[PDB]
Amino acid sequence: AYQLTCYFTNWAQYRPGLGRFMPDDINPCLCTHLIYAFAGMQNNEITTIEWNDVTLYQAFNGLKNKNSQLKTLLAIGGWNFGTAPFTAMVSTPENRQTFITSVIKFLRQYEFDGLDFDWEYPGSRGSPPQDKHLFTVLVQEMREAFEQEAKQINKPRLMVTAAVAAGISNIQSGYEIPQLSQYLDYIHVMTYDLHGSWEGYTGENSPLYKYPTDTGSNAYLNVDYVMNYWKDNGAPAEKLIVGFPTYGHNFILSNPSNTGIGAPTSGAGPAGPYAKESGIWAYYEICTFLKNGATQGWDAPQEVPYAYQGNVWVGYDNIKSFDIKAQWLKHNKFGGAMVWAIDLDDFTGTFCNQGKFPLISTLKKALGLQSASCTA
Numbered sequence: 001a002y003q004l005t006c007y008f009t010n011w012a013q014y015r016p017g018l019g020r021f022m023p024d025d026i027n028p029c030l031c032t033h034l035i036y037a038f039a040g041m042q043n044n045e046i047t048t049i050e051w052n053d054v055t056l057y058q059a060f061n062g063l064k065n066k067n068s069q070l071k072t073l074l075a076i077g078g079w080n081f082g083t084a085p086f087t088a089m090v091s092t093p094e095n096r097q098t099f100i101t102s103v104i105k106f107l108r109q110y111e112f113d114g115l116d117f118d119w120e121y122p123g124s125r126g127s128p129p130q131d132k133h134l135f136t137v138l139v140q141e142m143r144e145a146f147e148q149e150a151k152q153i154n155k156p157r158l159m160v161t162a163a164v165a166a167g168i169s170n171i172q173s174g175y176e177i178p179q180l181s182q183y184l185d186y187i188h189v190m191t192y193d194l195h196g197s198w199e200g201y202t203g204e205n206s207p208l209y210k211y212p213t214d215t216g217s218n219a220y221l222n223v224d225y226v227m228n229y230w231k232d233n234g235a236p237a238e239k240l241i242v243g244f245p246t247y248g249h250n251f252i253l254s255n256p257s258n259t260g261i262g263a264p265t266s267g268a269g270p271a272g273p274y275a276k277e278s279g280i281w282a283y284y285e286i287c288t289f290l291k292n293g294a295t296q297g298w299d300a301p302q303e304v305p306y307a308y309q310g311n312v313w314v315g316y317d318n319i320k321s322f323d324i325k326a327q328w329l330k331h332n333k334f335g336g337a338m339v340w341a342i343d344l345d346d347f348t349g350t351f352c353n354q355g356k357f358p359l360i361s362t363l364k365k366a367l368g369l370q371s372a373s374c375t376a
C-alpha cells in the first residue's frame, strides 16, 4: 500500500571514517525500492561514472538475494550532470533509440529492475523549450520499449520513474504532467532544497506548510503546496512519491541575536567533517552539532526543527518532522516516500543514539511497512 524508495549515492564511498557508505551498509529490509545515484551518458548511451561502479552494482543488486520483494532502479543524470547530454539525446528519434537500447541492455546485464530519470531539468539550465515535450516522447518511447522487451524475454517489465522539480517555474517549463503520468510508474517529487543560503535569510529545507509570513511565490515553497500542485495538475495521487531529505541546510547568521525563521544570513554554513558539503549537513552531522550544545528550535507552523549556535543556523528534519510528514502523506493518499539519501541518515546508529537509520526507520514504521517480508 505504501512505497519507501531510498537513494544511494556512489560518491558516499569516498567519505572519511564512519561516513564511508557502501552498498553492503544498506539494510535490505529497510526500503521497498532502492535507487542508485547515478549513471551518466556517453555518445547517447548510458554508462558508468565511477571506476568501481560495476562492483558496486553487484553488491547493490545482490541485496535482492536477501529480500525477494526489494526492487532496485538505476538513476541517470542528477544536478551535476546538467542538461546538455539529455538535450542532444532527445533531439532525434535515432539518438533516443540508441539510448533506450543501451538502457535495456545495461539494466538487464547488471540486474536493475528499472531506470529513474533525474534530468534537472527539461526546459531549464540551458535545456531549450522543446525538451519539455521531448522528455515526454522519451519517457513514452522508453515505457513502450520496456513493454515490448518484457514480452519477448517473458519477464516482468523494467520500470521507468522520474525525479521531478518542486519549484513551480521549473515544473511549468519542464513537464507534460498528465501525459508523463500515464507512462511513468512513479513520480519522485524533490520536495526539499526549498530554502537555503542562496536566499539571504534562514528558512527550512523541507517545511510541510507555509510560514504565516510567506507571501507571493514564497508561499509555494513547502511540501503541501508542491504535492497538491502535482496532484491538481494531473498526476494521480497513487503515483506521486513525496521526497524526504535526511540532511539539512545551514547558514551563516548576519547577527547571532536574530535566530528566527526569516533571519538575515551572510552565506552558506560550513561543510561538515564527513560529507564535506558547503551549506549542507547530514542528519548524523547535525546530531554532533546538537551534542555540541546548539539551541534546539521548532518551527511550529511548518512542523520542522531548526538549530543554532554562535553565528551558524541549520533547518533540517528529525524523527518528529518525518513522522508528521508521513501521517500527512497517508491522509492525502500519496503513494509513498522517497528519501535522499540513505547514506546521510544515521546509518551506524552512533551519532544520534536513536538506533540504526533513525529517520528512514520512522518512515518504515509510519507507512506500515514494519511487517513487510524480508526473505530470499
Ligand SMILES: Cn1cnc2c1c(=O)n(CCCn1c(=O)c3nc[nH]c3n(C)c1=O)c(=O)n2C
Binding pocket: 011, 038, 077, 078, 079, 080, 081, 118, 163, 190, 340
Ligand atoms: C555525480 N556526483 C558525484 N559527486 C557528487 C555528484 C553529484 O551529482 N552531486 C549532486 C547531487 C545533487 N542532488 C541531486 O542530484 C538530486 N537528485 C535527486 N535529489 C537530489 N539531491 C538532494 C541532490 O542533492 C554531489 O553533490 N556530489 C558530491
Ligand SMILES: Cn1cnc2c1c(=O)n(CCCn1c(=O)c3nc[nH]c3n(C)c1=O)c(=O)n2C
Binding pocket: 079, 193, 196, 198, 279
Ligand atoms: C540542487 N542544487 C545543487 N546545487 C544547486 C542546486 C540548485 O537547485 N540551484 C538552483 C536553485 C537555488 N539554489 C539551490 O537550490 C541550491 N541547492 C544547493 N545550492 C544551491 N544554490 C547555490 C542555489 O542557488 C543551484 O543554483 N545550485 C548551485
